[PDB]
Amino acid sequence: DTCSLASPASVCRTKHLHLRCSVDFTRRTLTGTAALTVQSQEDNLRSLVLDTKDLTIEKVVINGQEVKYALGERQSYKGSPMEISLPIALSKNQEIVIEISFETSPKSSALQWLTPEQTSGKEHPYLFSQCQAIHCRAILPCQDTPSVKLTYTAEVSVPKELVALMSAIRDGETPDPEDPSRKIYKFIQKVPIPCYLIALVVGALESRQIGPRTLVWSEKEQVEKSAYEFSETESMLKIAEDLGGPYVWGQYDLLVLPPSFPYGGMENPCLTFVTPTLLAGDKSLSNVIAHEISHSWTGNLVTNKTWDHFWLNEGHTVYLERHICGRLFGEKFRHFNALGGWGELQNSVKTFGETHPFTKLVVDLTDIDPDVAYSSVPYEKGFALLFYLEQLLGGPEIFLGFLKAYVEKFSYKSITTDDWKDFLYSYFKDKVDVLNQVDWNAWLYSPGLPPIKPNYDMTLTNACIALSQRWITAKEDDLNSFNATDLKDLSSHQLNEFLAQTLQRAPLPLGHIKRMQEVYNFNAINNSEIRFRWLRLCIQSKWEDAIPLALKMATEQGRMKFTRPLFKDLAAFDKSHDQAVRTYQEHKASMHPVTAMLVGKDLKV
Numbered sequence: 001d002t003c004s005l006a007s008p009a010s011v012c013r014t015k016h017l018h019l020r021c022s023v024d025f026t027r028r029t030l031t032g033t034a035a036l037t038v039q040s041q042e043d044n045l046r047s048l049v050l051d052t053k054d055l056t057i058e059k060v061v062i063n064g065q066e067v068k069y070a071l072g073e074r075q076s077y078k079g080s081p082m083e084i085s086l087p088i089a090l091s092k093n094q095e096i097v098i099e100i101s102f103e104t105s106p107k108s109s110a111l112q113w114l115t116p117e118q119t120s121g122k123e124h125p126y127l128f129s130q131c132q133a134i135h136c137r138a139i140l141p142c143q144d145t146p147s148v149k150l151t152y153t154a155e156v157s158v159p160k161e162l163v164a165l166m167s168a169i170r171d172g173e174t175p176d177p178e179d180p181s182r183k184i185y186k187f188i189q190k191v192p193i194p195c196y197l198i199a200l201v202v203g204a205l206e207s208r209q210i211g212p213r214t215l216v217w218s219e220k221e222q223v224e225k226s227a228y229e230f231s232e233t234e235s236m237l238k239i240a241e242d243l244g245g246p247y248v249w250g251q252y253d254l255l256v257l258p259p260s261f262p263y264g265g266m267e268n269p270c271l272t273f274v275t276p277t278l279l280a281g282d283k284s285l286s287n288v289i290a291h292e293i294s295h296s297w298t299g300n301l302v303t304n305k306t307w308d309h310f311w312l313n314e315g316h317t318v319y320l321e322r323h324i325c326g327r328l329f330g331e332k333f334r335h336f337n338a339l340g341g342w343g344e345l346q347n348s349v350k351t352f353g354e355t356h357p358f359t360k361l362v363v364d365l366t367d368i369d370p371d372v373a374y375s376s377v378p379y380e381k382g383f384a385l386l387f388y389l390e391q392l393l394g395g396p397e398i399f400l401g402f403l404k405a406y407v408e409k410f411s412y413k414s415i416t417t418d419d420w421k422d423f424l425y426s427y428f429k430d431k432v433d434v435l436n437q438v439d440w441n442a443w444l445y446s447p448g449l450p451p452i453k454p455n456y457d458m459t460l461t462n463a464c465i466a467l468s469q470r471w472i473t474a475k476e477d478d479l480n481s482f483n484a485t486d487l488k489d490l491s492s493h494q495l496n497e498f499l500a501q502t503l504q505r506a507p508l509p510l511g512h513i514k515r516m517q518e519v520y521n522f523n524a525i526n527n528s529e530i531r532f533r534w535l536r537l538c539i540q541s542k543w544e545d546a547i548p549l550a551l552k553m554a555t556e557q558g559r560m561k562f563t564r565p566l567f568k569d570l571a572a573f574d575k576s577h578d579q580a581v582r583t584y585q586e587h588k589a590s591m592h593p594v595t596a597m598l599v600g601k602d603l604k605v
């Protein structure tokens with residue numbers, strides 16, 4: 001694992017973590033002990049190395065004594081390696097507990113600390129983590145590689161008026177014996193997980209039950225809205241369980257974060273984190289819930305061995321997500337979404353450039369920060385491979401037979417693309433002549449669009465294309481012919497696909513865009529997906545009225561899918577360039593650390 005400085009799994013394995021920590025909002029630090037139960041995989045083992053990043057190590061204790069350790073030079077985004085000298089050589093399979101006293105930095109890339117004013121309630125601060133891909137090392141010392149899976153337990157001391165939650169089953173709460181102004185919250189995760197799945201939130205959280213195994217959590221002011229938006233959650237889990245086999249994690253809770261959470265969702269086990277930008281009022285963005293739910297099998301049970309194999313997580317998850325959505329809403333909607341994602345894949349390839357290395361399915365992340373490499377490619381190129389294979393190998397019933405057999409086979413494991421491919425050939429041994437027609441080298445290792453486009457039903461897409469082609473080919477004397485009734489029979493999804501289609505040909509003339517606002521009033525739409533693509537189209541077609549609206553969206557929430565391109569677009573428009581740069585600088589300190597970093601790079605600031 002070229003993203004990790006720890007001793008590899010072939011040397012030693014973390015089996016368990018017991019975390020005892022206290023969250024200090026005054027110093028913005030988390031402080032305490034990580035006791036790692038580590039098993040040797042080698043004879044005569046006398047040292048091992050752990051990932052850290054911006055941690056302050058106080059001491060390391062094994063068998064009740066302090067032992068020697070050293071921190072190496074920082075290696076950029078990877079952090080500094082921590083070599084621990086064991087007091088007695090270990091034989092193969094011997095296990096020991098190593099206790100590390102540490103403290104985090106305020107600038108931990110895994111954490112965002114928010115003041116009272118950056119929250120809903122305006123009285124309490126809030127903390128949330130995000131470990132994927134390699135940020136767990138910025139919280140505690142660990143072997144920070146998805147190739148190692150451990151169970152864990154934790155005890156978290158917090159201001160007594162706040163709530164701690166983790167990616168684990170809640171195991172109780174009591175006053176802190178060391179400090180009566182504090183509560184300790186307790187947690188257990190009995191299913192082995194890669195460390196990137198470790199998660200913590202502390203804040204003034206409330207919950208409402210929305211299904212037999214699902215509570216939503218958020219601040220008070222978001223709970224009622226959230227409960228309604230995600231009400232299809234149980235029914236999606238049932239479908240996910242029919243497709244993937246038993247849900248093994250006990251609880252499936254949802255946390256809805258403050259608006260700076262950088263992602264649509266993060267499949268932390270027992271507690272999926274989501275963006276508030278999902279709250280569209282009508283459940284239209286629930287594909288993201290189905291995506292997070294699918295990860296309970298693809299990602300969380302079968303895990304990528306290293307980040308070069310991320311597509312394994314994402315493509316199988318999009319593949320299952322799209323199935324859940326097609327069960328709920330029909331096979332033509334499955335194809336509709338499948339086809340739009342091919343649209344998103346053309347976008348990403350066009351941006352990076354068709355020969356760019358980040359456009360490969362399997363990437364080499366050796367000296368690359370995974371946060372810089374992250375995009376739609378592993379999701380959409382991964383999904384396009386599986387949809388192609390589905391159509392090659394006999395259809396969805398046949399291919400879902402394989403996905404379920406693949407999950408069973410590799411549950412509680414971390415695997416490579418070769419692992420996936422050997423199993424695909426084993427499973428379809430009677431269809432190997434067909435599998436040998438796939439150009440594996442191109443599909444897996446080459447840049448750009450896949451060598452083959454799957455067959456997609458167009459039924460629901462057609463109206464979207466038709467309307468978009470009318471706008472694009474319209475001349476000034478055609479603009480009168482447009483009318484609100486054009487949108488009459490389009491769902492929010494089709495309206496969003498109309499804008500995505502139109503956006504692919506942007507800029508349009510400014511008079512067209514103005515007319516579009518005149519007849520359709522897209523400014524009134526608060527659906528974050530739609531509003532996003534509409535502001536993009538407006539800025540790219542050089543409408544100045546749209547600058548304040550685009551600046552406002554870019555900074556009122558922080559989902560990088562929306563914030564990054566809105567800032568990029570505003571920077572590339574000469575009228576808003578200076579203001580874009582200025583607005584970033586003014587917001588930078590209060591932004592998510594990873595978000596700040598990428599937007600900063602994006603703007604060349």
Ligand SMILES: O[C@@H](c1ccncc1)c1ccc(OCCN2CCCC2)cc1
Pocket residue numbers: 132133263265266267307308309310311358361363370371373374375377378
């Ligand atoms: O493995 C990297 C990659 C591989 C292949 N192509 C591109 C990138 C990668 C980069 C960033 C990640 O960060 C994860 C942040 N997320 C949390 C929820 C959604 C994504 C996770 C993985």
Ligand SMILES: [Yb+3]
Pocket residue numbers: 475477478
């Ligand atoms: Yb004309």
Ligand SMILES: [Zn+2]
Pocket residue numbers: 291295313314317
């Ligand atoms: Zn995902």
